[PDB]
């Protein structure tokens, strides 16, 4: 392949002959690395010598980036970097430009070569000339960050940190200068934008990411986009711009040196107007920056305290109305105002604690207890979205003080909402959202507080190791996680989206036991949505790199949970389990022994589980010779015993007979399909014995095309069954016809 790649590199006008096309495609999908890099090197040399007519094959090229090799990915990066550097204006560049930053964290070498690749590609000093090159560089960066929003932003900021750490000394600071040479130009772009809102929000997200990485630049340009925060239309992208600029000021105002007091003041008041005249999301994302700027330098928190007092008095009026008038129509008129009050009090509890000696300024009334009790009272309401708003306020207030969930009635709130097969689906979504967010802020605050250890190092003691400050975060899961387990058995899939996100971030923090939720994680590795099973298998292999036998512990439980999952819904789904466990002979042998004996001998299980077990069994991708031989041998043993007994009992002699005969028929059909698919002589099957020699039956299996006739026939014989019981003559004729088929299968060789 390497040589003929050089041949076709000399003469590109030959890549049309069909058999060599089949060969090069087969070597693209060959089961070895070196052929894959040779073939992709061929295609890349064709692309560089012939830019046109290769974009039809660009989809295969871009799917060859992820090949679990070492040099194959280096080669494809070289190819795509040269594609990017030689022809601009290709229609699928930026989407292309997404995918490899997704692989920057994969290995150390890829991290490097991609970093200087993009640094030469993008982050060069670029002296004061050639404005248009800088201009469409900015354009390309904006298109990249705009296409970045759907999947996730963490990869590119991680790249930014990779460049940041790469230059620990001065080294002229080549990207760093260029970095500021970028950002003001983006501001200049905004300065010339002046009017299409997608490009605006892409630019503000570029500024957002630059604020995330390090906030040292935008200290001079804050007043330039100050008029843009003030007042805009009722469009959603404008709201996102408002949230984003609130985050950006939240970062940059603490760093900027000696600010104007009236500037922060007028920002404060205009953003409270933005609170009182807009929706909830902007209110949250901006009360974050209000809490920051109020509790960061200035001291005018009495005005915000009075605003809290106003909302508290309003909600006190509403609850006092509802004390004696649960059916009052005055509450419906200001019901969205009540919702806004709930969000406001939750947010004011969220950002910082106002139950302090300076915010109250008087004798302690413990207003946090009163507000949580009142939110408990408002939680028990007849309408549904008010309870949604109550749970929102619960989570937001719970952010600041985690010990508040330790109270019993809070636990009662969760387990009564989530269990009992609640009619409302939304309330589960918001409470799981609260849990996921909760994990997110606590992770972020402990990570940031790790960074500034030196500023707090000498005002804290040794003999204690304050750990309940961390322990409570762990401890709360032992109150409810088991409840969350039956939360997994829900028909709606946003429920399982949030539940998997919660448990994934939990074990990412790992304050819980690993192998307690694995059969659930196994089961929802069989989900229709790719992200779900993606995170599920990812977490499974994350444990597998670290603990060996743990998934081997949870073997049949995953099968039963999977059956429950496909009840909730109404090739092998659990094949990735086999893909991981293919190494060890003993444990895989034990698992198949346990399966085939226990679920096929005496246990009066439902036929449908065994149907999908055999479906997976025939649809697991097996790699070497011995495993189907062992399957067929123990099948022959158990089948001879059970079939002889069942046929002699029926000859002596029945819905139970119908069910056990259906299971035996299932075993016959699985055996027959496997024996056809392996394409092996039945005499060698007769000759085989378990554990003869390890090195004899290691040969590569051939899989033939269109053999999968087991699921159709099993579905036919199950629709013949349907667990039906009736006294017709036709069911007796079906029984005797299946008995004759049993005699035939008994008589086969």
């Amino acid at each position: 392949m390497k040589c003929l790649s050089e041949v076709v590199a000399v003469d590109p006008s030959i890549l049309a002959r069909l058999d060599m096309q089949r060969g090069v495609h087969g070597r693209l999908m060959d089961n070895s690395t070196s052929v894959r890099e040779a073939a992709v090197e061929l295609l890349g040399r064709f692309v560089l010598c012939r830019p046109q007519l290769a974009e039809q094959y660009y989809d295969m090229l871009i799917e060859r980036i992820l090949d679990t090799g070492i040099s194959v990915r280096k080669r494809v990066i070289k190819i795509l970097r040269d594609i990017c550097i030689e022809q601009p204006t290709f229609p699928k560049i930026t989407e292309m430009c997404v995918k490899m930053i997704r692989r920057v964290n994969d290995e150390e070498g890829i991290k490097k070569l991609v970093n200087e690749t993009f640094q030469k590609l993008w982050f060069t000093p670029t002296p004061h000339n050639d404005k248009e090159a800088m201009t469409r560089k900015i354009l390309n960066i904006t298109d990249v960050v705009a296409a970045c929003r759907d999947t996730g932003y963490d990869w590119f900021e991680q790249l930014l940190q990779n460049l940041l750490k790469s230059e620990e000394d001065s080294s002229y600071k080549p990207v760093k200068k260029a970095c500021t040479q970028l950002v003001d130009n983006l501001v200049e772009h905004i300065l010339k934008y002046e009017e299409n809102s997608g490009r605006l929000v892409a630019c503000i997200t570029t500024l957002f990411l630059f604020s995330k990485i390090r906030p040292q630049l935008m200290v001079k340009h804050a007043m330039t986009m100050q008029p843009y925060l003030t007042t805009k239309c009722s469009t959603q992208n404008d709201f996102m711009v408002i949230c984003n600029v609130a985050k950006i000021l939240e970062l940059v105002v603490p760093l900027m040196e000696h600010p104007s007091e009236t500037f922060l003041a007028t920002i404060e008041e205009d953003l409270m107007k933005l609170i009182i005249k807009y929706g909830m999301t902007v209110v949250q994302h901006c009360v974050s920056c209000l809490g920051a700027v109020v509790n960061k330098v200035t001291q005018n928190f009495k005005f915000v305290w009075a605003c809290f007092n106003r909302y508290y008095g309003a909600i006190s009026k509403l609850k006092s109305q509802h004390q004696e008038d649960p059916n009052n129509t005055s509450l419906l008129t200001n019901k969205p105002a009540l919702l806004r009050s709930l969000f406001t009090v939750g947010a004011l509890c969220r950002h910082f604690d106002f139950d302090l000696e300076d915010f109250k300024g008087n004798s302690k009334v413990n207003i946090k207890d009163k507000v949580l009790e009142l939110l408990m009272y408002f939680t028990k309401h007849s309408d549904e979205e008010v309870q949604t708003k109550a749970i929102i306020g619960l989570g937001f207030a719970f952010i600041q003080h985690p010990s508040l969930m330790f109270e019993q009635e809070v636990k009662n709130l969760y387990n009564n909402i989530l269990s009992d097969k609640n009619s409302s689906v939304n309330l589960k979504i918001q409470v799981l959202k609260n849990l996921q967010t909760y994990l997110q802020e606590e992770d972020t605050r402990m990570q940031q507080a790790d960074r500034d250890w030196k500023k707090v190092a000498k005002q804290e003691d040794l003999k204690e190791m304050g750990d309940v400050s961390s322990g409570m975060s762990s401890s709360i899961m032992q109150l409810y996680l088991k409840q969350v387990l039956e939360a997994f058995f829900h028909t709606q899939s946003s429920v399982r989206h949030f539940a998997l996100n919660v448990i994934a971030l939990t074990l990412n923090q790992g304050l819980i036991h690993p192998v307690q939720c694995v059969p659930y994680l196994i089961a929802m590795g069989t989900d229709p949505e790719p992200a779900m099973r993606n995170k599920a298998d990812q977490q499974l292999v994350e444990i597998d790199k670290k603990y060996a036998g743990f998934i081997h512990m949870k073997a049949v439980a995953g099968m039963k949970m999977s059956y429950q999952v496909q009840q909730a819904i109404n090739s092998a789904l659990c094949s990735h389990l086999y893909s991981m466990i293919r190494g060890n002979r003993q444990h895989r042998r034990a698992f198949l022994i346990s399966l085939l004996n226990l679920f096929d001998d005496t246990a009066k299980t439902d036929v449908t589980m065994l149907l999908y077990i055999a479906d997976n069994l025939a649809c697991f991708p097996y790699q070497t010779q011995e495993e189907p031989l062992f399957i067929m041998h123990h099948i022959d043993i158990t089948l001879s015993v059970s079939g002889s007994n069942l046929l002699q009992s029926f000859k002596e002699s029945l819905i139970e007979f119908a069910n056990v005969s259906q299971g035996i028929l299932l075993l016959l059909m699985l055996k027959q399909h496997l024996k056809n698919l392996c394409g092996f002589s039945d005499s060698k099957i007769q000759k085989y014995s378990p554990s003869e020699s390890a090195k004899v039956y290691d040969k590569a299996i051939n899989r033939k095309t269109g053999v999968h006739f087991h699921p159709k026939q099993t579905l036919d014989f199950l629709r013949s069954d349907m667990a039906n019981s009736k006294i017709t003559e036709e069911v007796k004729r079906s029984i005797v016809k299946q008995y004759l088929d049993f005699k035939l299968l008994m008589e086969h060789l």
């Binding site: 058999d19 089949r22 060969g23 087969g26 999908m29 060959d30 089961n31 070895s32 992820l66 090949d67 679990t68 997704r102 999947t151 996730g152 963490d154 790719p530 992200a531 993606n534 995170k535 298998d537 990812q538 090739s571 094949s575 893909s579 991708p621 899989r703």
Partner: peptide, 18 residues
Amino acid sequence: ILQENDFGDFGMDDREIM
């Protein structure tokens, strides 16, 4: 000809995460 390969890409499907 398709002699030495993987069954589809099922052996080769490490997916992207968030």
